[PDB]
Design a protein around this ligand. Sequence first.
Ligand SMILES: NC(=O)c1c[se]c([C@@H]2O[C@H](COP(=O)(O)CP(=O)(O)OC[C@H]3O[C@@H](n4cnc5c(N)ncnc54)[C@H](O)[C@@H]3O)[C@@H](O)[C@H]2O)n1
Ligand SMILES: NC(=O)c1c[se]c([C@@H]2O[C@H](COP(=O)(O)CP(=O)(O)OC[C@H]3O[C@@H](n4cnc5c(N)ncnc54)[C@H](O)[C@@H]3O)[C@@H](O)[C@H]2O)n1
Ligand SMILES: [Zn+2]
Ligand SMILES: [Zn+2]
Ligand SMILES: [Zn+2]
Ligand SMILES: [Zn+2]
Lengths: 374, 374
Amino acid sequence: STAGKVIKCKAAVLWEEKKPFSIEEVEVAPPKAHEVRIKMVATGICRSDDHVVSGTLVTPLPVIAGHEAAGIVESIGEGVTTVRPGDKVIPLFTPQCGKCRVCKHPEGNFCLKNDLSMPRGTMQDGTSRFTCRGKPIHHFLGTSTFSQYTVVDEISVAKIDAASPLEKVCLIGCGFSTGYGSAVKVAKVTQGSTCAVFGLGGVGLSVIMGCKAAGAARIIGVDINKDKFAKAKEVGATECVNPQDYKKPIQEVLTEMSNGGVDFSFEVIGRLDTMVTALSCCQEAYGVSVIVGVPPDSQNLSMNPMLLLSGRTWKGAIFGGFKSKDSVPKLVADFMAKKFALDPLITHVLPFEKINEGFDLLRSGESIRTILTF
Amino acid sequence: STAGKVIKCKAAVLWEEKKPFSIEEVEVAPPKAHEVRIKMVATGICRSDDHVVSGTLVTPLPVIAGHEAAGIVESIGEGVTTVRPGDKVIPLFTPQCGKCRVCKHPEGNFCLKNDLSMPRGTMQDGTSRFTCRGKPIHHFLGTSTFSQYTVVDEISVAKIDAASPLEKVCLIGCGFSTGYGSAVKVAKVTQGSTCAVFGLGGVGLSVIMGCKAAGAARIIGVDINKDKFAKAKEVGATECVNPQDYKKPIQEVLTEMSNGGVDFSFEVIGRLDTMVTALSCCQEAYGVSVIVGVPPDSQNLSMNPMLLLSGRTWKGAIFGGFKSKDSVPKLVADFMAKKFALDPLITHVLPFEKINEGFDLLRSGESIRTILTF
Ligand SMILES: NC(=O)c1c[se]c([C@@H]2O[C@H](COP(=O)(O)CP(=O)(O)OC[C@H]3O[C@@H](n4cnc5c(N)ncnc54)[C@H](O)[C@@H]3O)[C@@H](O)[C@H]2O)n1
Ligand SMILES: NC(=O)c1c[se]c([C@@H]2O[C@H](COP(=O)(O)CP(=O)(O)OC[C@H]3O[C@@H](n4cnc5c(N)ncnc54)[C@H](O)[C@@H]3O)[C@@H](O)[C@H]2O)n1
Ligand SMILES: [Zn+2]
Ligand SMILES: [Zn+2]
Ligand SMILES: [Zn+2]
Ligand SMILES: [Zn+2]
């Protein structure tokens, strides 16, 4: 029934930054050529769209935020070859347009038709498909998943398995894939290796799961908050070290207990000081350090080039280096084949009308992951 | 004849820093087990042993500096399986002891029995084999090649081809191998790629030669001194850009002319600002930047983590990532097979008694490479 035409539905609008979201009724335009319209089912809440709210990630306001979700396909636009109505799908905040030189590159994943670098808050055609009372509402990362319905370009949706639990596989649209790929795809962790993960929120928990999948024989999880050590442990850490317990610097204590430094170090906290501390404690002649993510507000960090000189690799990346459209079906199939559990990351499930409440949880942080259901 | 016993010969001594070298007569002790004694033939002059002289590279004084040389084997000590008297050889300032975890590691090359990290200026047994009038003279990087004779441990000498031109292949003991490996072994430059080398002294010229060997279709050489552009060009650069010609920042102009940033950027200057500028102008989603070398005095450099986040790799290394003992024979055989020329790097050849003069050349810098002959 909704197929040819505009749908009217509730969605979360930010009309102004540093304001809670308004649940509004909006008009979701029908999809033009190579667009898909998706009925959302479950969307996670993540720091990055809370950065929008604070003014920190600058994306044009008013906006429908949301980038991490799974749902079902309703309308498909003209020339849509990959999805067909009724398909389970996950919006891709970092696309896979297939044509550019990053998509062609055998390792690059930060697709040039992305709205992260220079955010205009639109669909590829420069327009928006949201209007709240005639006023237009901008799209976020060409996903906007805090809406009952949304329209994405065919390069920003991946089709997934029919039997897929969408209240659990929506994590594969951001946080789980960002950490499990920082371990499996970016650092390319090895059989036998010693990994150290810094920070153990949902992303640090996804790293440990990846490092576990590659066969690391040690995963040292380090967090200044003791309460984090259990789930981390559950998920794969062999040891957990609380920096505030030692009189020394932890890179000392970590090189010390690693016999000269760990193989792979990962920075899941996002701070400048720990990006440096995690660089300084993988082995000198061959360790790899991977910055899993860095806040859009970050300033410069002081580092002494000597550290790289020994023979270290410093690596950063977006979405665990996964080419989005290719990989997300393959991760879901893996979840489907009981390779990894998403369950200890999902700590809360709230109805979508309780989005502001999910934020409260994220902001005082004891909440690994809040999922919002439609 | 000299074989069982102490040789008395001239060598360059630093008795005190910031002093020119004294040509002295010294007593080179006979080699103990697993030591080799080498009659030098040609040794190059390089910034690193001039850093010693300035106080900057702290190594114990008095010392016989010199790390880059080729020569012939005179005495071998007890249990020496790799060289036999009369063998052409090159002292290895960074060893290949075969046993440690860096030597075992498939990429690591900064061997743990090295005297670079924590320099004690001795042979592996903690003693010295030099005495000038009863007073002991320390060894440099377990090589000390500014002496007519020297003793090295069997892990710090590689045997090379009999027909080898030792006045030309001594470059393979430091400067040529440090740049040609930063291109061929560390960055692993590719067929078709666009490389940018920053700084074009003898090392930057060795990079261009490596990038050329890997098949890069562009080698942009960039130096604020115009006079460098010719030899660079000769050696393989396709274009040379002089930063002072543009009103803009060169990473702009370089990303601009590279269509979004080069593949591989190399910093051969050693400055902090250009380590940053070369990081910032390889492609965002997949470029690799390699710091070829950094002065022992360097302080911290300000950098914004964002640069790594896109998907960049920052890599440093010692001796072009070559495992010393394995690789140097293979490079010489390549020179021998007319794969690369060492000739445009060798600009001066002076007799060894003119060491201080070779320094003068290096310090006012128009001299690509001064070789000293015995
Ligand atoms: N901007 C990004 O792209 C990005 C990616 Se990861 C990231 C940062 O990570 C967080 C999101 O990832 P996440 O799911 O892990 C939520 P999080 O906030 O729980 O992650 C940070 C973790 O580090 C811990 N921590 C704080 N300081 C220290 C310290 N000095 N040493 C060791 N542990 C410490 C926290 O207790 C926590 O578990 C964000 O809140 C932000 O701080 N930003
Ligand atoms: N400490 C190390 O391990 C190490 C490795 Se190479 C390195 C530095 O490199 C030099 C040794 O290597 P080399 O054989 O190339 C001798 P060099 O001094 O000739 O190398 C530096 C090159 O960079 C050029 N240069 C200076 N400033 C700029 C600039 N702002 N932008 C572009 N070009 C510029 C110089 O004209 C020169 O060709 C040392 O003198 C030192 O400065 N230190
Ligand atoms: Zn693309
Ligand atoms: Zn996210
Ligand atoms: Zn070794
Ligand atoms: Zn050198």
